[PDB]
Assembly symmetry: C3
């Protein structure tokens, strides 16, 4: 209730990353335009909380990740932090854990996440995008994964996701060369899911998110769980898997769906 | 009959045939599938199985929604309907003899599930594809989801399942959801000639290759014994015996295994 | 020499495994399969080499399946057959598990064991006009587990079956859309394309390249994010000589001169 101080307001506005609620969407907005959204420790550390906020808010159905009005999604890592975070082995290990946690938080979001990409999406930028469920990019976006250019190695999680999306050959091409490639190529590789006109990615993501928001959220969330399960060893016989299917018939959205199909009208689903 | 088996050696055709409901899949039909598949695998004149929508101008509009009240009334009935469908799809997926789906017109919901359970898919231009449980407040089962994932990958699977959208055969093709895309109305002839190509080689090899692939998909490795011994029976069976012999005699092989 | 049916050419930073039995369109024989693991080891042992290429030399074919003239001998007895299988499996495994990455450059015929070789390499580039086929079904045999695994991983279940159930020959364009090859180039240019590609890779940190390859193979055979080898692989990223040089190069804004060999 208490209105702020001027400074408090500025601190929340100049967060290098933030959450905008516009029901039924929530938008994780990268917000360090001075550095073309280069990913810093402050940002990585904030992500798991932002994702939680969004999943906790019943008015939100879908999460978007985008680069705001910075004309870039994420231009790799903040080199100004390199001295600090790579000074010691311990600092380095911590940086890794912190990043892995952010990506895992996104990947395992109960509610689905769509990445909307314009301009530069390199290094951790690709990692973020890959952690999202869906990716849409505007023509002119540039993609690259560059640890080989530093003498590093792309982590297991990041590598697993990339592999799942584009396969072994393309994953190696990307990682062995560290090359920057175009959105059109990314599209044919299967690295992104939809390719749109330059500057329209965010609008495209929003309408797409609208399509998803209109169907049963019970189903959407369950489908996502089922897919993650299967990707990590579930089988047809696995109990969580069988029972996940069976709650399909028990939830509030299901009766409305049956009825809607019989009446030939769009479903007005209630589960939130 | 709403579903049936037509034998035309070397093919067997599982034909869906409830045109009144655009081949919407009912409990009677799902329950018949495992038997039809077995009939076909048991018959030595049959080498390849086709699944198609007959002359109903649709492959399958999925499950019969008019049965939904009954079969999903109780938790027990629901569990049974799921088991019954899963059994049909598994029966197809694990058919000793390979199965080709020939798709025209609508292939949605359980339709896609059937198609994904087949080994090969050919579709005519104008076929429409969709997977819609999200529009009913349901969830796509694990088996069905596994197969779809294996064919088109995580991004496309989610697109399909999160939107429940209907998409065209051309798009299906580029997604890798179907294997061959042909002229409208020709899918069934295309499937038949394709089946003919396969029928002409060693059926021992075909059936062994299918076993090896399923094995690998469910945890086999290079070191696995069934896998090693499957390979080695390659050199012991009658078709290879015949193949070896044919090469030595410089004549075409007449394969006998069935 | 150059009478050798298969050999290793060193041209630092590349090593080229060159198939060279043009009289049989590089059809793979037992002498050749048996030589492969050693050639791969030679190359991995030589610190001047960073990347390995496999190609069909000036024979206008990558590999035209198995040597038919050996069929009687190697498949005469069960024992001979078992041995042939082991010998081939060992060649393919040697390639697949090469510390240093391997690129296949394909022109013309790539059938049977030809495809198996190509699939064992990390990367594949092919010229238009290359022809691809996997044919054990035509002889009454079955494609081994390793070969099948790799093919499956590259093109998925539907396409793997199409290929194997029909034994049909198909074009490089189709191979490309199937994901069977990684890059498709103009006829006759595959080898040059492979070389420049290999040059791109050779220019970055070899520590990273070799680690990336290990990480991928790990993930393909059951590793998870939680797996210790995986966690510690990542962390040695920050400890090795190339990263030290990489860090310094980024700070000084200059190209890295990577030293790990």
């Amino acid at each position: 209730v208490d209105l702020g101080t001027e400074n408090l307001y500025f601190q929340s506005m100049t967060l290098p990353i933030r959450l905008d609620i516009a029901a039924p969407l929530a938008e994780i907005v990268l917000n360090k335009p001075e550095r073309r959204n280069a990913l810093s420790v402050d940002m990585w550390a904030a992500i798991p909380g932002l994702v939680a906020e969004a999943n906790a808010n019943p008015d939100v159905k879908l999460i978007l990740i985008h680069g705001g009005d910075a004309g870039a999604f994420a231009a790799g890592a903040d080199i100004s932090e390199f001295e600090t975070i790579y000074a010691t082995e311990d600092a380095a290990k911590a940086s890794g854990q912190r990043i892995a946690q952010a990506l895992d938080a996104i990947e395992n979001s109960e509610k689905p996440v769509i990445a909307a990409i314009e301009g530069a999406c390199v290094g951790g930028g690709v990692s973020l995008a890959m952690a999202a469920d869906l990716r849409v990019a505007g023509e002119g976006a540039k993609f690259g994964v560059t640890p080989g250019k530093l003498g590093l190695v792309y982590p297991a999680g990041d590598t697993r996701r990339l592999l799942a999306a584009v396969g072994p050959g393309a994953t190696k091409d990307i990682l062995f060369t560290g090359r920057i490639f175009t959105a059109g190529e990314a599209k044919s590789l299967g690295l992104i899911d939809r390719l749109v006109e330059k500057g329209t990615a965010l609008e495209a993501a929003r309408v797409w998110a609208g399509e998803i928001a209109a169907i049963s959220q019970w189903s959407v969330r369950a489908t996502k769980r089922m897919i993650r399960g299967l990707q990590t060893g579930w089988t047809d016989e696995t109990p969580e898997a069988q029972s996940l299917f069976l709650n399909g018939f028990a939830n509030e959205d299901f009766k409305e769906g049956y009825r809607a199909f019989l009446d030939k009208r769009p479903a007005k689903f209630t589960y939130r």
